[PDB]
Amino acid sequence: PTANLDRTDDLVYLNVMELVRAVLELKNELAQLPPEGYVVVVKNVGLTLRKLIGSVDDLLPSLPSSSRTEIEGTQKLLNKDLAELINKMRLAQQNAVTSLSEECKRQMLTASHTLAVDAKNLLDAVDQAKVLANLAHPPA
Amino acid sequence: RELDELMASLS
Amino acid sequence: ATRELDELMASLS
After folding, report:
1. Under an 8 A CB cutoff, do B4 and A20 touch?
2. Nearest residue on chain C to A41, judged by CA atoms?
3. How close, in Å, is residue B7 to chain A by CA atoms?
4. CA–CA separation, A21 vs A19, rounded Å?
5. Which residues have C-beta within 8 Å of that of residue A137, sequence separation ≥ 6?
6. How far, CA to CA in Å, does A81 sit from each of A4, A86, A114, B3, B5?
7. What is the CA radius of gyration of chain A?
8. DSSP codes, A7-70
9. Membrane-spanning regions, if any (chain B)?
10. Residue numbers in A near C3 (CB within 8 A)
């Protein structure tokens, strides 16, 4: 599970939920959505990711350099995650009505899902880092 | 904390 | 560092 901290001022934490929401939108809207409708949902995931990464970069200064590292670690990974979600989405768009019509959509669901899981692991490291740097406070 | 429940919601 | 991400973000739409 996740740390229980004071989330009221945790912009990281909120950006994670939003991203998870966007990812969740995608999941149970692919079956319904048309090909041009794919760009929009993938865009929101992207949008909430850049929000997220921005609020982590704002923090990265005030925290330990061994954590700066695996944070920057998964931050890199998340870009690689979005890259794949876009490209699988483009495939899915271009391969509506062909052999791997469905197979490309499975790949979108995978890519977004693993994006959500990584974002969580980002939150987790961030939580630990705040603790390790006397920065964290218990739920209010 | 309840993001965990949001998380298992992805499954 | 944000240069790689807004590259992908520009590409769609």
Report:
1. no
2. C12
3. 8
4. 5
5. A5, A6
6. 27, 9, 7, 21, 23
7. 17
8. -TT-HHHHHHHHHHHHHHHHHTTTTT--THHHHHHHHHHHHHHHHHHHHHHTTSSSS-TTHHHH
9. none
10. none
Q: Looking at chain C, how many residues does it have?
A: 13
Positive or negative torsion for Cα A109, A115, A120, A124: positive
Two tokens at A24?
């969740």
Amino acid at A54: G
* Interchain CB distance below 8 Å, B1 and A116: no
- Interface A–B counts its CB contacts (< 8 A) at 30
Nearest CA in chain B to A23: B10
Which residue of chain A is at minimal alpha-carbon distance from B4? A1
Answer yes or no: CATH 1.20.120.330 is held by domain A1-140: yes
Check CB contact under 8 Å for B10 and A116.
yes
Distance to chain A for B1, nearest Cα, Å:
5
Retrieve residue A121's tokens. 């692991």
Return the closest-CA partner of residue A30 out of A83, A103, A79, A87. A103
Cβ-contact A130, A63 below 8 angstroms: yes
